[PDB]
A paper describes a structure:
Shy (side chain hydratase) and Sal (side chain aldolase), are involved in successive reactions in the pathway of bile acid side chain catabolism in Proteobacteria. Shy contains a MaoC domain and a DUF35 domain, the latter which is responsible for interaction with Sal.
The crystal structure of ShyMaoC was determined to 2.05 Å resolution by molecular replacement using a protomeric model of the protein as predicted by ColabFold as the search model. ShyMaoC crystallizes with two chains in the asymmetric unit; these protomers superimpose closely with an r.m.sd of 0.3 Å. ShyMaoC adopts a hot dog fold, with a central bent five-stranded antiparallel β-sheet (topology 2, −5, 6, −7, 4) “bun” wrapping around a central helix “sausage”, inserted between β2 and β3. The two ShyMaoC protomers interact to form a homodimer with an interface area of 1001.9 Å2 (as determined by proteins, interfaces, structures and assemblies, PISA). β4 strands from adjacent protomers interact in antiparallel fashion to form an extended 10-strand β-sheet; in addition, the central helix, α5, and α4 from the active site housing of each protomer interact to form a four-helix bundle which buries an extended nonpolar surface. The loop C terminal to this central helix is also greatly elongated, forming β3 of the auxiliary domain before linking back to β4 of the central β-sheet; this pushes these residues to the periphery of the binding site, where they form an extended wall of an open pocket rather than forming one side of the substrate binding tunnel. Together these changes produce a continuous open cleft that spans the width of the β-sheet with an approximate volume of 2895 Å3.
Author numbering:
A (entry chain A), B (entry chain B): 159 to 312
The structure:
Amino acid sequence: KRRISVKDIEAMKSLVSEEYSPWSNEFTVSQEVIDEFARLSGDDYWIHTDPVQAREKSPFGTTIAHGALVQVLASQLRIPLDYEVVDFNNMVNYGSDRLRFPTPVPSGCKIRARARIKAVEQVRSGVQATMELNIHVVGQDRPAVINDLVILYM
Amino acid sequence: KRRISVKDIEAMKSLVSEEYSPWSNEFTVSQEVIDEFARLSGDDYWIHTDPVQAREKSPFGTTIAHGALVQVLASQLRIPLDYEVVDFNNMVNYGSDRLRFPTPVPSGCKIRARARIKAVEQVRSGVQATMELNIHVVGQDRPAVINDLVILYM
Ligand SMILES: [Cl-]
Ligand SMILES: [Cl-]
C-alpha cells in the first residue's frame, strides 16, 4: 500500500477525494441484534422492538434498527483502502462532526459501508482527518447512516 | 412543568440557555457492559477489553469504555427537565452536529448526564432544536461525551 506520513501535510491533504472506497463486507442487522442493543442502551422504542405492532402500524412495514445501532456496527465493516497513514505516535477516534440517519435499516437486512477523506486540518495536537463514512442497506443507493468521523493523528 | 408550544417560536427560542438541567440518575459502566459492546459492535480494542494488558501498557492504567458506548448509554439516563414541548405530531432524532469524547470512562465507574438547548431554528418541516448533551463520570467536571443532538419537531 501507498504510505503517507502525517508529517507530510501536503500529502495528507492529497487524500481528500470525492470518490468513495470500494464497498466493505456485509453484516446482517437481525432482530436479535436490535433487541440486544435495545436492552444494552435502554432505548426500547417499539418501532425497533415490536414486530407484531410495527407490521400493523409502522410507516416502514416492519421493525427498523436504531440509528445509533447502525452507527456503531461500523466496527463490523472493513473498508478496503489502498493507502496507509504512518509516522504518527498515536491515532485517536476524536468523535464526529456530523451524524445523520436519512433512511432506516429494516430488521433482517444487511448493511455495508464505504468512505472517503472529506477534509484534513493541522490542529494544535496534530492532524485532524475527517472521514465521511456512509453505511447503506445492501442494494440501497441512499445511505442509512452518515458519519463525518474525525480521526486525530498525534 | 411548563409547556412550550412548538407553534410559538419566541417561546421555543427562550429555551436557549448557557446553563444545564439538573443531573440525571446514575448508571454503572461495568467491564461486562464494555465487553458486550465490544462483541456487539465488533470493536475489541484491547484498551477496552484486556484489563491485564491495560494495567501494564495502557496510558490510563486500566480499561476504559468505548466513546460510542458511553454515547448510546444516554438512553439509560433520564434527565429531569422543568419544561415539556408540545403541540407537535412527531419528534425525530435527526442526528448530531457534534460528537466528542474529551475524557475517558474507567471500567466500573458510574456516569450521569445533563443537557441544555443550544439553538432553535424554524425549518420547512417544522422546528429544529439542537440540544447539547453532556455525559460525565459522576464527580468529574470534564464531560466524557459531548453530543449536540438535533431534534426535528414535525
Ligand atoms: Cl485517495
Ligand atoms: Cl475540535
